[PDB]
Design an enzyme around this catalytic site. Structure first.
Site, PDB file in Angstrom:
ATOM      1  N   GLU A  59       0.830  -1.202   0.000  1.00  0.00           N
ATOM      2  CA  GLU A  59       0.000   0.000   0.000  1.00  0.00           C
ATOM      3  C   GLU A  59       0.865   1.254   0.000  1.00  0.00           C
ATOM      4  O   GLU A  59       0.532   2.252  -0.650  1.00  0.00           O
ATOM      5  CB  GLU A  59      -0.938  -0.007   1.210  1.00  0.00           C
ATOM      6  CG  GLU A  59      -1.737   1.278   1.397  1.00  0.00           C
ATOM      7  CD  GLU A  59      -2.179   1.505   2.834  1.00  0.00           C
ATOM      8  OE1 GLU A  59      -2.212   0.532   3.615  1.00  0.00           O
ATOM      9  OE2 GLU A  59      -2.491   2.660   3.185  1.00  0.00           O
ATOM     10  N   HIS A  60       1.989   1.212   0.718  1.00  0.00           N
ATOM     11  CA  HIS A  60       2.911   2.341   0.751  1.00  0.00           C
ATOM     12  C   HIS A  60       3.492   2.635  -0.624  1.00  0.00           C
ATOM     13  O   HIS A  60       3.683   3.800  -0.989  1.00  0.00           O
ATOM     14  CB  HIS A  60       4.035   2.055   1.740  1.00  0.00           C
ATOM     15  CG  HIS A  60       3.828   2.679   3.077  1.00  0.00           C
ATOM     16  ND1 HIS A  60       4.182   3.983   3.347  1.00  0.00           N
ATOM     17  CD2 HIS A  60       3.294   2.188   4.217  1.00  0.00           C
ATOM     18  CE1 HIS A  60       3.887   4.263   4.602  1.00  0.00           C
ATOM     19  NE2 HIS A  60       3.343   3.193   5.150  1.00  0.00           N
ATOM     20  N   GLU A 136       6.729   6.022  10.664  1.00  0.00           N
ATOM     21  CA  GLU A 136       5.297   5.945  10.930  1.00  0.00           C
ATOM     22  C   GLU A 136       4.987   4.971  12.056  1.00  0.00           C
ATOM     23  O   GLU A 136       4.005   5.158  12.778  1.00  0.00           O
ATOM     24  CB  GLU A 136       4.535   5.557   9.667  1.00  0.00           C
ATOM     25  CG  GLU A 136       4.068   6.753   8.868  1.00  0.00           C
ATOM     26  CD  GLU A 136       3.785   6.411   7.429  1.00  0.00           C
ATOM     27  OE1 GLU A 136       3.383   5.260   7.175  1.00  0.00           O
ATOM     28  OE2 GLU A 136       3.964   7.288   6.558  1.00  0.00           O
TER      29      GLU A 136
END
Ligand SMILES: CCCCCCCCCCCCCCCCCC(=O)OC[C@H](COP(=O)([O-])OCC(O)COP(=O)([O-])OC[C@@H](COC(=O)CCCCCCCCCCCCCCCCC)OC(=O)CCCCCCCCCCCCCCCCC)OC(=O)CCCCCCCCCCCCCCCCC
Ligand SMILES: CCCCCCCCCCCCCCCCCC(=O)OC[C@H](COP(=O)([O-])OCC(O)COP(=O)([O-])OC[C@@H](COC(=O)CCCCCCCCCCCCCCCCC)OC(=O)CCCCCCCCCCCCCCCCC)OC(=O)CCCCCCCCCCCCCCCCC
Ligand SMILES: CCCCCCCCCCCCCCCCCC(=O)OC[C@H](COP(=O)(O)OCCN)OC(=O)CCCCCCCCCCCCCCCCC
Ligand SMILES: CCCCCCCCCCCCCCCCCC(=O)OC[C@H](COP(=O)(O)OCCN)OC(=O)CCCCCCCCCCCCCCCCC
Lengths: 440, 74
Positions: A59-60, A136
């Protein structure tokens, strides 16, 4: 309309399928904007301990370039039309969607197929995103609610892939290679597990033609899913440097397709939610909310019904100072018991009204409807209409609520997460004894 | 002194199981017997010698006392 004619006048979700098994679903309106996305039956529960975090990593890297649109080009295209590209990942689902103008649906659809089909997964980008994902992770450590729910999942589903976090441990973040990610995409980004949803000013026939022009290459027509044992257990991380304590308690609740979900949600609406920025305070119909406002026992509490395919977390999360955790437990478990034994019709009526309002108000805008369509086709294989949800709510009474809360809450072992100044978080045996009543 | 204001504690995580998920007598003999033997070797030379001395002193005092009530030829 009388809300019975308004439910009957809601537009119908149209669903089709490609030969490869990609499902195409759309709810049309007359709005000049649309949301179109791909929802994939892929999550962390599909990852083992070595691959855990690969889906979040993919997804990143999703918008960082495809073989057709290198790097920023894709972003430029999105930004050059006013569209908005978003993505998310859970333990079971993954989503990539665009909010665009209705005349941008072809390009949007094209932009999605490329993204799910032809992500570059370039090693340089993989290292840059490695650094980003580590930062993150440290950012997520600062969020006490995220940590307490990761803890709840880790202890409730210990030994199972549902205990895994979405992002994975930081060691996997450092170790995941391009081969890991290409394998993850090749085994999970398949047409039979994907749903192309669109809500808004979108004609279903045109979206179907777009999907047949852009997604037909995908896998035609295998490791997937083992059940996850639930465990009554507790994980307590004491950090008296933290100003407030977070406590999450959940029993094993039903999975997605279980009808018990509708009465249980009703019951949760009876307990409700609260934080210290509420108008109603002491006058709230929820007993726990009024006690928390009168005594200032907590900063917030929320009920939840987290569902997976075959199990879930049915419970409550609350935030309070160190000297009130015990009280917050006592009044919360008591409410559970009061619902299992003495539900009462009028508050069942209030909770039913709350549930209908939540369901209707949630589906406001193209994006919530697009998510509803995609996630619904993944979890139920169908878009359940709001008229049907209303039929299921209408068949709830105090006998039904008493019975289902007895089945799930009464004399059940909960899973417990405590984070912060939690010395006054009650011992597990005391909570477990709070899960039944001697008077009853 | 109440729960919630006893000390400052930090960075300590505890994991526990429900009593209904686990057993009340796991490895009660396969582990309990070696533990009792370990706990016995650990303390036996601290506890036993005083009671050995009492046994010897008691034995001697009793037999001697009874050896005084016997007639000595005279
Ligand atoms: C009859 C069977 C018992 C019964 O119906 O109890 C009802 C009721 C407890 O009902 P519950 O709904 O399970 O309690 C939830 C409450 O919110 C109470 O919630 P709580 O968090 O304040 O307390 C939970 C727990 C807290 O634990 C205790 O209260 C400890 C009990 C004594 C432990 C030993 C103390 C030292 C000796 O409560 C109990 O264990 C039950 C109440 C106290 C009974 C004490 C019996 C002592 C016998 C000696 O207790 C009483 O009404 C007590 C009087 C009647 C007793 C028999 C006469
Ligand atoms: C005047 C006298 C009035 C009465 C005095 C009563 C004092 C308190 C008794 C109740 C009590 O709280 O006992 C706790 C005490 C410890 O409870 P636990 O859960 O067994 O503790 C295990 C240890 O953590 C660790 O245990 P472990 O792994 O070293 O050994 C496990 C097991 C292993 O034993 C065997 O496998 C025996 C094989 C032959 O043996 C025991 O647990 C001993 C129990 C019987 C003595 O239980 C006993 O001592 C039970 C018998 C009590 C009567 C006196 C015996 C000397
Ligand atoms: C001797 C009496 C019994 C002592 C051993 C049992 C005990 O300590 O508590 C038993 C009973 C259950 O108490 P508890 O598990 O705290 O649940 C209360 C409701 N939440 O707690 C009681 O107080 C039972 C009272 C029975 C009368
Ligand atoms: C010496 C210590 C034990 C005293 C005698 C047993 C008292 C009653 C305990 C009991 O019900 O079972 C004891 C023993 C092991 O049982 P336990 O490890 O507690 O749990 C196994 C099943 N979950 O299981 C059994 O003896 C059989 C139980 C059926």
């Amino acid at each position: 309309a009388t809300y019975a004619q308004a439910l009957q006048s809601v537009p119908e979700t149209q669903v089709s399928q490609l030969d490869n098994g990609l499902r195409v679903a759309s709810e049309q309106s007359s709005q000049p904007t649309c949301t179109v996305g791909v929802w994939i039956d892929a999550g962390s529960r599909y990852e083992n301990e070595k691959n855990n975090g690969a889906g979040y990593f993919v997804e990143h890297l999703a918008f960082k370039g495809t073989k057709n649109r290198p790097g920023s080009a894709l972003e430029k295209e999105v930004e050059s039309m006013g569209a908005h590209l978003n993505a998310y990942s859970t333990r079971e689902h993954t989503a990539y969607y665009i909010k665009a103008l209705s005349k941008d649906l072809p390009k949007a659809v094209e932009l999605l197929a490329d993204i799910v089909q032809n992500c570059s997964l370039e090693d340089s980008q993989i290292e840059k995103e490695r650094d980003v994902i580590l930062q993150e992770l440290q950012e997520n450590d600062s969020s006490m609610r995220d940590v307490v729910f990761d803890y709840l999942h880790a202890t409730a589903f210990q030994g199972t892939p549902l205990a895994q976090s979405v992002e994975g441990p930081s060691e996997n973040v450092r170790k995941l290679s391009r081969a890991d990610l290409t394998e993850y995409v090749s085994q999970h980004y398949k047409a039979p597990r994907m749903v192309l949803a669109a809500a808004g000013g979108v004609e279903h026939r045109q979206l179907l033609d777009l999907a047949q022009k852009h997604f037909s290459s995908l896998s035609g027509t295998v490791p997937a899913f083992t059940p996850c044992r639930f465990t009554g257990s507790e994980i307590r991380h004491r950090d008296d440097a933290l100003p407030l304590a977070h406590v999450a308690i959940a029993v094993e609740g039903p999975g997605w397709a279980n009808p018990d979900n509708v009465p249980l949600q009703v019951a949760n609406a009876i307990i409700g939610h609260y934080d210290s920025t509420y108008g109603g305070g002491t006058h709230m119909s929820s007993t726990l909310a009024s006690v928390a406002a009168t005594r200032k026992l907590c900063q917030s509490f929320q009920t939840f019904n987290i569902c997976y395919a075959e199990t879930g977390l049915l419970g409550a999360h609350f935030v309070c100072d160190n000297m009130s955790i015990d009280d917050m437990m006592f009044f919360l478990q008591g409410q559970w018991m009061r619902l299992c034994t003495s539900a009462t019709e009028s508050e069942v009526v209030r909770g039913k009204n709350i549930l209908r309002n939540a369901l209707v108000s949630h589906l406001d805008g193209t994006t919530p409807v697009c998510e509803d369509i995609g996630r619904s086709l993944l979890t139920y294989g169908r878009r359940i209409p709001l008229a049907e949800w209303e039929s299921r709510i209408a068949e709830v009474d105090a006998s039904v609520v008493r019975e289902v809360c007895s089945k799930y809450f009464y004399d059940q072992c909960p899973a417990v997460a405590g984070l912060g100044p939690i010395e006054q978080l009650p011992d597990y045996n005391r909570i477990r004894s709070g899960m039944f009543w001697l008077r009853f | 002194r109440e729960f919630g204001h006893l000390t400052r504690m930090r960075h300590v995580i505890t994991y526990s199981l429900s009593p209904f998920e686990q057993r009340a007598f796991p490895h009660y003999f396969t582990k309990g017997i070696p533990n009792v033997l370990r706990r016995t070797r650990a303390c036996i030379l601290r506890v036993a010698p005083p009671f050995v001395v009492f046994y010897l002193v008691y034995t001697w005092g009793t037999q001697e006392f009874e050896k005084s009530k016997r007639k000595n030829p005279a």
